[PDB]
Design an enzyme around this catalytic site. Sequence first.
Site, mmCIF file in Angstrom:
data_model
loop_
_atom_site.group_PDB
_atom_site.id
_atom_site.type_symbol
_atom_site.label_atom_id
_atom_site.label_comp_id
_atom_site.label_asym_id
_atom_site.label_seq_id
_atom_site.Cartn_x
_atom_site.Cartn_y
_atom_site.Cartn_z
ATOM 1 N N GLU A 144 31.570 22.220 29.883
ATOM 2 C CA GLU A 144 30.522 22.087 28.877
ATOM 3 C C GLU A 144 29.980 20.663 28.820
ATOM 4 O O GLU A 144 28.765 20.457 28.705
ATOM 5 C CB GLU A 144 31.067 22.516 27.516
ATOM 6 C CG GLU A 144 30.011 22.820 26.471
ATOM 7 C CD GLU A 144 30.607 23.405 25.202
ATOM 8 O OE1 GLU A 144 31.851 23.442 25.086
ATOM 9 O OE2 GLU A 144 29.830 23.831 24.321
ATOM 10 N N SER A 150 27.296 25.248 16.021
ATOM 11 C CA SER A 150 28.023 25.765 14.867
ATOM 12 C C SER A 150 28.795 24.640 14.174
ATOM 13 O O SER A 150 28.822 24.563 12.942
ATOM 14 C CB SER A 150 28.973 26.881 15.293
ATOM 15 O OG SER A 150 30.070 26.350 16.012
ATOM 16 N N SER A 208 29.806 18.081 17.943
ATOM 17 C CA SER A 208 30.540 17.305 18.929
ATOM 18 C C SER A 208 29.777 16.020 19.211
ATOM 19 O O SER A 208 28.545 16.027 19.312
ATOM 20 C CB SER A 208 30.753 18.092 20.229
ATOM 21 O OG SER A 208 29.524 18.355 20.876
ATOM 22 N N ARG A 231 33.961 12.969 25.389
ATOM 23 C CA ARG A 231 33.850 13.478 24.028
ATOM 24 C C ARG A 231 34.574 12.518 23.090
ATOM 25 O O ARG A 231 35.789 12.326 23.209
ATOM 26 C CB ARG A 231 34.437 14.885 23.922
ATOM 27 C CG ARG A 231 34.222 15.544 22.565
ATOM 28 C CD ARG A 231 34.835 16.941 22.507
ATOM 29 N NE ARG A 231 34.360 17.697 21.350
ATOM 30 C CZ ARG A 231 34.967 17.720 20.166
ATOM 31 N NH1 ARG A 231 36.078 17.025 19.973
ATOM 32 N NH2 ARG A 231 34.457 18.434 19.172
HETATM 33 N N1 ANP Z 1 17.800 32.028 15.408
HETATM 34 C C1 ANP Z 1 18.958 31.393 14.985
HETATM 35 N N2 ANP Z 1 20.044 32.099 14.683
HETATM 36 C C2 ANP Z 1 21.123 31.459 14.285
HETATM 37 N N3 ANP Z 1 21.246 30.162 14.146
HETATM 38 C C3 ANP Z 1 20.198 29.402 14.433
HETATM 39 C C4 ANP Z 1 19.002 29.996 14.868
HETATM 40 N N4 ANP Z 1 18.092 29.020 15.091
HETATM 41 C C5 ANP Z 1 18.663 27.853 14.816
HETATM 42 N N5 ANP Z 1 19.947 28.054 14.402
HETATM 43 C C6 ANP Z 1 20.870 26.974 14.046
HETATM 44 O O1 ANP Z 1 21.476 26.563 15.259
HETATM 45 C C7 ANP Z 1 22.902 26.566 15.112
HETATM 46 C C8 ANP Z 1 23.528 27.003 16.430
HETATM 47 O O2 ANP Z 1 23.152 26.023 17.396
HETATM 48 P P1 ANP Z 1 23.632 26.109 18.922
HETATM 49 O O3 ANP Z 1 23.381 24.775 19.614
HETATM 50 O O4 ANP Z 1 22.911 27.229 19.659
HETATM 51 O O5 ANP Z 1 25.210 26.348 18.870
HETATM 52 P P2 ANP Z 1 26.287 27.273 19.611
HETATM 53 O O6 ANP Z 1 26.434 26.792 20.992
HETATM 54 O O7 ANP Z 1 25.751 28.732 19.580
HETATM 55 N N6 ANP Z 1 27.687 27.117 18.806
HETATM 56 P P3 ANP Z 1 28.850 26.161 19.566
HETATM 57 O O8 ANP Z 1 29.863 27.143 20.217
HETATM 58 O O9 ANP Z 1 29.553 25.381 18.542
HETATM 59 O O10 ANP Z 1 28.233 25.254 20.672
HETATM 60 C C9 ANP Z 1 23.217 27.577 14.008
HETATM 61 O O11 ANP Z 1 24.432 27.197 13.370
HETATM 62 C C10 ANP Z 1 22.013 27.395 13.064
HETATM 63 O O12 ANP Z 1 22.266 26.348 12.122
HETATM 64 C C1 MZI Z 2 31.040 19.308 24.901
HETATM 65 C C2 MZI Z 2 30.915 20.070 23.582
HETATM 66 O O1 MZI Z 2 29.905 20.008 22.964
HETATM 67 O O2 MZI Z 2 31.993 20.835 23.113
HETATM 68 C C3 MZI Z 2 31.675 21.730 22.082
HETATM 69 C C4 MZI Z 2 32.503 21.344 20.858
HETATM 70 O O3 MZI Z 2 32.961 20.254 20.792
HETATM 71 N N1 MZI Z 2 32.752 22.280 19.773
HETATM 72 C C5 MZI Z 2 33.551 21.765 18.677
HETATM 73 C C6 MZI Z 2 32.931 21.058 17.658
HETATM 74 C C7 MZI Z 2 33.678 20.542 16.614
HETATM 75 C C8 MZI Z 2 35.047 20.737 16.597
HETATM 76 C C9 MZI Z 2 35.878 20.158 15.458
HETATM 77 C C10 MZI Z 2 36.569 18.902 15.972
HETATM 78 O O4 MZI Z 2 36.207 18.374 16.969
HETATM 79 N N2 MZI Z 2 37.689 18.349 15.249
HETATM 80 C C11 MZI Z 2 38.345 17.188 15.694
HETATM 81 C C12 MZI Z 2 38.422 16.121 14.609
HETATM 82 N N3 MZI Z 2 38.994 16.680 13.349
HETATM 83 C C13 MZI Z 2 39.781 15.882 12.445
HETATM 84 C C14 MZI Z 2 40.220 16.440 11.242
HETATM 85 C C15 MZI Z 2 40.998 15.597 10.420
HETATM 86 C C16 MZI Z 2 41.267 14.297 10.854
HETATM 87 CL CL1 MZI Z 2 42.245 13.201 9.859
HETATM 88 N N4 MZI Z 2 40.807 13.879 11.998
HETATM 89 N N5 MZI Z 2 40.075 14.661 12.783
HETATM 90 C C17 MZI Z 2 38.275 17.911 12.916
HETATM 91 C C18 MZI Z 2 38.171 18.919 14.054
HETATM 92 C C19 MZI Z 2 35.674 21.429 17.622
HETATM 93 C C20 MZI Z 2 34.925 21.944 18.666
HETATM 94 MG MG MG Z 3 26.663 24.939 22.004
#
Ligand code: ANP
Ligand code: MZI
Ligand code: MG
Lengths: 352, 352
Positions: free
Chosen positions: B121, B175, B178, B190
């Site tokens: 990713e 969602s 990152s 990251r």
């Molecule tokens: N048509 C839509 N449906 C749902 N969410 C949408 C839409 N358009 C925009 N969004 C927003 O875009 C966000 C999702 O963004 P996106 O970059 O596509 O993430 P994702 O890859 O699907 N989730 P992740 O697994 O964390 O990477 C949602 O949480 C909404 O806040």
């Molecule tokens: C390349 C790419 O885009 O990958 C997609 C991606 O990353 N998805 C994703 C997004 C967000 C998260 C959440 C998260 O990263 N953490 C780490 C840090 N946390 C804490 C909590 C307490 C303390 Cl005291 N310190 N740290 C919270 C949880 C996990 C996956």
């Molecule tokens: Mg994504």
Amino acid sequence: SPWFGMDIGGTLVKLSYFEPIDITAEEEQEEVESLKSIRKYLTSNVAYGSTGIRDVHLELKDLTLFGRRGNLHFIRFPTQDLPTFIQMGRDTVLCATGGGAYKFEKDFRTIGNLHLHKLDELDCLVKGLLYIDSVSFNGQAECYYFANASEPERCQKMPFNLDDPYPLLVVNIGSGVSILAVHSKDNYKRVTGTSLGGGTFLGLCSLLTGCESFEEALEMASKGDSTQADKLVRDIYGGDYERFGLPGWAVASSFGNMIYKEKRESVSKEDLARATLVTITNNIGSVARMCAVNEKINRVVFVGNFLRVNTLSMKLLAYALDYWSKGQLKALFLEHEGYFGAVGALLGLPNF
Amino acid sequence: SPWFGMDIGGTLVKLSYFEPIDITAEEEQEEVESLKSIRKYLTSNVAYGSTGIRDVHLELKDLTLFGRRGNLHFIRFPTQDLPTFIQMGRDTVLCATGGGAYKFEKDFRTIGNLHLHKLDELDCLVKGLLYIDSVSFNGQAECYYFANASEPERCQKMPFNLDDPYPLLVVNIGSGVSILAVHSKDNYKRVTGTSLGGGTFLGLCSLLTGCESFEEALEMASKGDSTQADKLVRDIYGGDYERFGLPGWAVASSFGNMIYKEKRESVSKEDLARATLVTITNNIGSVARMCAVNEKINRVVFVGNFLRVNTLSMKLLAYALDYWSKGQLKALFLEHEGYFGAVGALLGLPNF
Ligand SMILES: Nc1ncnc2c1ncn2[C@@H]1O[C@H](COP(=O)(O)OP(=O)(O)NP(=O)(O)O)[C@@H](O)[C@H]1O
Ligand SMILES: CC(=O)OCC(=O)Nc1ccc(CC(=O)N2CCN(c3ccc(Cl)nn3)CC2)cc1
Ligand SMILES: [Mg+2]
Ligand SMILES: Nc1ncnc2c1ncn2[C@@H]1O[C@H](COP(=O)(O)OP(=O)(O)NP(=O)(O)O)[C@@H](O)[C@H]1O
Ligand SMILES: CC(=O)OCC(=O)Nc1ccc(CC(=O)N2CCN(c3ccc(Cl)nn3)CC2)cc1
Ligand SMILES: [Cl-]
Ligand SMILES: [Cl-]
Ligand SMILES: [Mg+2]
């Protein structure tokens, strides 16, 4: 005058009261009756009106302050009820801190001849924290941590020594969050803050669950499952994401499962309360970790009243800070966490 | 085979499709009918089924890729509808990234003889971002910022040059969130993440307002007043707090005014939608600022689909990042912000 220190926050007023216990026979005759009724009323009651509470367990006994021996008492009530407090007074030097010291300055001066001295919130918090830790909690440690916070069969509260407390990152969780870096007794700064604090937990929980008190919100959260509302790493990947060291149980999106109508219809109030608590607490820990890395400080102490009778958030902070920092940061807690501003204000009294 | 790049996120599937336009007379005869119906179906429709959408405005025309000229198309649909997508296929080499590339690997292999190649990713996002910016947006800049974001009578979208894009802090708001630090084309990491992202906005807004779509949530928020739910610095102090450079309008406690029952009973759905958007967006900006300070990077680019058709959050990020950094950080945005993983996956095709 009665020696009081007041911290008027956005949610709670915190009051520290020094009750002298070395009253001689002559001093008792010279005291006015309003003073005797005040001291008796404060020491003969643990509930004041309908919303005032004295935290008896926090009392410091036989403290020597300003050349006198006495007991230090800790009292709180909602800021919403400050008009009642001021009206009780209208029918003295007041050292006050917090935002309400400015907002309600004109109200305090409706008490005739009362001198209000507004004191810096940062100065009061730091001086109060260092003072309480210096005099100890009646011979016990004021500061503690949760040892072996990774293993729950071992995680237990243990004392922590702050005799050389510098440097120190102080995370003040009130309605919002303020992060302070303390480098010395005269060198400290507000690093930053976040608006996701205790007021967010209580306000969101009330909107989502209908709870009517902070205590009821915590009781709901203790029965809930935050994973019913949150989307976890394993929900997105099917398991752990080893490439970035993310365990399957880590929350990827707080309330993220609530984008599905069927899940909104099956989630319980307790689940939503727990998800609110977990969301706010994890965000606080993450901001604290990031600030600690930038300030190059490895001891992070949490204060405020968001953690009062809130062992869930304490243990979550201890576990998260240790886990996500790979063991390089230590979460520290303080028995008098809600009252350091009020104590620091009381300590400014000799300057007037 | 048709050249596709797929990013299967927790919420949306993003698809990049390269349509060759240099098809000779002989190549057209050699093509199979299923391939012709696929290419015609994708180019003759902007809506696919009930939930698929082609973002026609993002199309890159007359792009030279893998020695061929063609058009690069950008298509999205909900991950919840991936079973329908796979079933349409069951009645090729697929480069796929995102969490769903792992979670749904066995499902893709129900398509006989289909070779699924899971791609990193982080690699896909960085390679896709750098590629799109390198080929430009049909001669226009791929990257832009909001100039003079402090003055609203002047805040306007302006192009930004990334010809030497290193270093770069990439804030991916899906969602969750990152945060990536890009030091070179082969040196990126990251940094961290937070769980308060687009899924939090959509999930909380649905719980609080009953909105049924991301678009409806944004429309509600555009009509609301977040200060009806939030507690501001001036609510606590009565004005600005100059000692710590906090303006009266800064949010001290998100949803903090919702601790009062009378305020919960007067707040509107639109107000709560706006407070959800402001809370999430400000937290994202603050975490981005803290990471930028630690990584010593001053250019912060925001990607993901949380910012799709979301000018409120874009302008809030531009204003907040400039204001709170005293002008030392610049918020940058990208026209193809939701699709860089899908493009980066497509670019991994020659490796197989
Ligand atoms: N048509 C839509 N449906 C749902 N969410 C949408 C839409 N358009 C925009 N969004 C927003 O875009 C966000 C999702 O963004 P996106 O970059 O596509 O993430 P994702 O890859 O699907 N989730 P992740 O697994 O964390 O990477 C949602 O949480 C909404 O806040
Ligand atoms: C390349 C790419 O885009 O990958 C997609 C991606 O990353 N998805 C994703 C997004 C967000 C998260 C959440 C998260 O990263 N953490 C780490 C840090 N946390 C804490 C909590 C307490 C303390 Cl005291 N310190 N740290 C919270 C949880 C996990 C996956
Ligand atoms: Mg994504
Ligand atoms: N009895 C209570 N009533 C209300 N909130 C409580 C209570 N007990 C604990 N809390 C929690 O404690 C938080 C307030 O903590 P506190 O340190 O007293 O802040 P404050 O000073 O009143 N607000 P601030 O102006 O931001 O400093 C609330 O947001 C709740 O999450
Ligand atoms: C000594 C003491 O305890 O004082 C009491 C106290 O501090 N109360 C308080 C708590 C929290 C706040 C909120 C806050 O600090 N900020 C500053 C940083 N922000 C952002 C936003 C976006 C970006 Cl991009 N960057 N930064 C968010 C708002 C304000 C007051
Ligand atoms: Cl004063
Ligand atoms: Cl593979
Ligand atoms: Mg306070």
